[PDB]
Write a protein that binds this ligand. Structure first.
Ligand code: HEM
Ligand code: HEM
Ligand code: HEM
Ligand code: HEM
Ligand SMILES: COc1cc(C=O)c(OCc2cccnc2-c2ccnn2C(C)C)cn1
Lengths: 141, 145, 141, 146
C-alpha cells in the first residue's frame, strides 16, 4: 500500500527517467535474463541474444505499461486489467519472476539515476513495483 | 560456480568497493526498504527516518562486518557452507532470522553495487554477483537444511 | 486484488463463523504458536500456555479485527490504519509471520467448516488473508 | 526432521486413515486452484480452466496419488528424507526448475486437506507434527538447490 510520500517519490523518479524508459526497460530485461536464466522460458519465441531487437521492443512495452501504472497509481487494478488478464490468466506467471524483474529494474535505475535513487526513493519504488506485480499476478476478473 | 571470466570480473570490481561506506549503505537500505528488519536492531538506536538510519553509527559500523563477511565468501567461493557455519548458527539457531531476509540483503547489496559503479555494473557482472549473493544466502541458511 | 466472487466467498465463509469468532481465532493462534514457535517471540508478555485466557481473548479481537476487515474489504487501508500502526510501525512484525497465521486460519476453517471450504472458497480466503496481511505489514501513514 | 515419539504415533495413526485414492488429488487440485501459476507445469493435463474442471480432472487425480505416495515414503524414512528424495530432488530442481517456494505451498495445501478430512481429530499438536513433516519433505525436495 503506497503512502502519500511513496506516490510522489515514484512520480518524480519516473519523471526523471524521461525518454530513456524504453532503454531502461530493455536493460532490466537483459539483466533479468542473464542473472536468472529460468525466466527465459517465458519467452521461447524471443530472440534473446545480446542487443536483440525483440528485447528492445518488449522493453519499451514494459516501460510504457509501468508509465501507465505511475499515471494511475491510485486505480491500478482498473488501469492494468488488460495486463492482469495476460499475465495471470493466460501466461500464469509465477510471482517470484516479478520479484526478479522488479529487482533488475531497481538495479537499472540505481545504475543510471544515482542522484534519484536515495534510500527513501528506493523504498518507494520497491513498493510501487511490488504493487504492480500484485495486480498483474492476481486474477480479479 | 563462476566461469574464469566471471571470477575475474567480480574480483576486479570488488577491489574498488569502498569498505567504509558500502557495508553501511546496504544495511541501512535493508532497514529502510524492509522496515520489519528494524525489529532485530532495537539496541542500535534511532531508526525512525531514512536519514536517521543511514546516519546511525551502529548501522555503519555493523555494515562493515557484513561487507567483510561477503569478502570472505569471495575468497572461499567453493566452500561457503563452512565459511558461514558459525554465522549460520548465530542467525539461524540463535536469532531466528527468516532466511528470505538473507536474500533481501544480498539483493540490496547488488543495488548498492549498481548505485556506486554506474554503467560499470554491467548485466554480465551483475549475473556473476547474483550467483555470489545466492551462495552466501544459501550458505547462511545451511543450518535450516 | 480481490475479485467480485472472492468478496462474496469471504463474506459467506467468514459469515458462517459467527459466535465462534473467538473460538476459531484462539485455535488458529494456538495452531501458530505450536506449529511455528518463533511466532511466540511477539508475545513474551503473554501466557501462551494451552488454554490460556489471554490467548483466548486475544484470538477474539483478531476474529473481530478480521470481521472488521471483511466489513471494509474495499477500504482496508483506512479501516485497518490503527492495526497497521501497531504491526508495521510499532511491532515491526516480519511478513512471513502473517503467512503462518494465515495458513493456520485456513487450517482452522477447513477443520471446522468442511462443507464450505471448497477450493474456490479456499483460494478466496487465501487471497483475502494475503490482502489483510500486506495492509497490516506496510507503512502508508 | 525430529518428531518426538508421541508425534510419530499421532502422525502415523492419522495417515493410516487417509484415503490414498483421493487426498493426493485434492491437494494437487487445490494447489492448481489456489496458486494458478503452478498449472504452467501441467499443460499436458488438459482441462484446468475451472476449479470444477481441475478437481474432477482424471490426470490431476492420478498424479496426486503419486505425490501422496512420495509423502508416504517420506513418512517411513523421516531420518533420511534427503536420500529418500534424492531422485525427485534432481527432477524438480535440475530438469523441471520448480521454484522451491512451490514445495512449501504444496505441503501446506496438503495440511489444509488433512484438516479438511479429519476435523477436530486434526488437533494443533497433530498439525504441529505434520508441519514438521512437510517442511522436512519440502527441504529435501529443494536439496539440489543447496
Ligand atoms: C513490471 C512488471 C511487468 C510489466 C509492467 C509487464 C508488462 C508487459 C507488457 C506491456 C506486455 C505486452 C503485452 C502485449 O504485447 O500486448 C507484456 C507481455 C509479456 N510479458 Fe510481461 N510485464 C511484467 C513482468 C513480466 C514477467 C516477470 C514476465 C516473465 C518472467 C513476463 C512475461 C511476459 C510475456 C511472456 C509476455 C508476452 C510476450 C509476447 O508474446 O510478446 N512479464 N508484459
Ligand atoms: C544476508 C547476509 C548476512 C550476512 C553476511 C550477515 C553477517 C553478519 C555478521 C558478520 C554479523 C556480526 C557477527 C558478530 O558480531 O559476531 C552479524 C550479526 C547480526 N546479524 Fe547479520 N548478516 C546477514 C543477514 C542478516 C539479516 C537479514 C538480519 C536481520 C534481518 C541479520 C541480523 C543480524 C543481527 C541482529 C546481528 C547482531 C546485531 C546486534 O549486534 O545486536 N543478519 N551478521
Ligand atoms: C489477519 C491477521 C491479523 C489480524 C486481523 C490482527 C488483528 C489484530 C488486532 C485486532 C489486535 C488488537 C487490536 C486492539 O488492541 O484493539 C492485534 C494485536 C496484536 N497482533 Fe495482530 N493481527 C493479525 C496478525 C498478527 C500476527 C501474524 C502477529 C505476530 C505473529 C500479530 C501480533 C500482534 C500483537 C503482538 C498484538 C498485540 C498484543 C498485545 O496487545 O499485547 N498480529 N492484532
Ligand atoms: C512438495 C512436494 C512434492 C512432492 C512429494 C512431489 C512428488 C512428485 C512425484 C512422486 C512425481 C512423480 C515422478 C515420477 O513418477 O518419476 C512428481 C512429478 C512431477 N512434479 Fe512433483 N512433487 C512435489 C512438488 C511439486 C510442485 C510444487 C510442482 C509444481 C508446482 C511439481 C511438479 C511436478 C511435475 C510437473 C511432475 C511431472 C508431471 C508430468 O508427468 O509431466 N511437483 N512429483
Ligand atoms: C498475495 O495476493 C494478493 C492479492 C491482492 C489483491 C492483494 O491486495 C492487497 C491490497 C488490497 C487492497 C488494496 N491495496 C492492496 C495493495 C497493496 C499493494 N498493492 N495493492 C494493490 C495492488 C491492490 C494482496 N495480495
Amino acid at each position: 500500500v503506497l503512502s502519500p510520500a511513496d506516490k510522489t517519490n515514484v512520480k518524480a523518479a519516473w519523471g526523471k527517467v524521461g525518454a530513456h524508459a524504453g532503454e531502461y526497460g530493455a536493460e532490466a530485461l537483459e539483466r533479468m535474463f542473464l542473472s536468472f536464466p529460468t525466466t527465459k522460458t517465458y519467452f521461447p519465441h524471443f530472440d534473446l541474444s545480446h542487443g536483440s531487437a525483440q528485447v528492445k521492443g518488449h522493453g519499451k512495452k514494459v516501460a510504457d505499461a509501468l508509465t501507465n501504472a505511475v499515471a494511475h497509481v491510485d486505480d491500478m487494478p482498473n488501469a492494468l486489467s488488460a495486463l492482469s488478464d495476460l499475465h495471470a490468466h493466460k501466461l500464469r506467471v509465477d510471482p517470484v519472476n516479478f520479484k526478479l524483474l522488479s529487482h533488475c529494474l531497481l538495479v537499472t535505475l540505481a545504475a543510471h539515476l544515482p542522484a534519484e535513487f536515495t534510500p527513501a526513493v528506493h523504498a518507494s519504488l520497491d513498493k510501487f513495483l511490488a504493487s504492480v506485480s500484485t495486480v498483474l499476478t492476481s486474477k480479479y476478473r | 560456480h563462476l566461469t574464469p571470466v566471471e571470477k575475474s570480473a567480480v574480483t576486479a570490481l570488488w577491489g574498488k568497493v569502498n569498505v567504509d561506506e558500502v557495508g553501511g549503505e546496504a544495511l541501512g537500505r535493508l532497514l529502510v526498504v524492509y522496515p520489519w528488519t528494524q525489529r532485530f536492531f532495537e539496541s542500535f538506536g534511532d531508526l525512525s527516518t531514512p536519514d536517521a538510519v543511514m546516519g546511525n553509527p551502529k548501522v555503519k559500523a555493523h555494515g562493515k562486518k557484513v561487507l567483510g563477511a561477503f569478502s570472505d565468501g569471495l575468497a572461499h567461493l567453493d566452500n561457503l557452507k563452512g565459511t558461514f557455519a558459525t554465522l549460520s548458527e548465530l542467525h539461524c539457531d540463535k536469532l531466528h532470522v527468516d532466511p528470505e531476509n538473507f536474500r533481501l540483503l544480498g539483493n540490496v547489496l547488488v543495488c548498492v553495487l549498481a548505485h556506486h559503479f554506474g554503467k560499470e555494473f554491467t548485466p554480465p557482472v551483475q549475473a556473476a554477483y547474483q550467483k555470489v549473493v545466492a551462495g552466501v544466502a544459501n550458505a547462511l541458511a545451511h543450518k535450516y537444511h
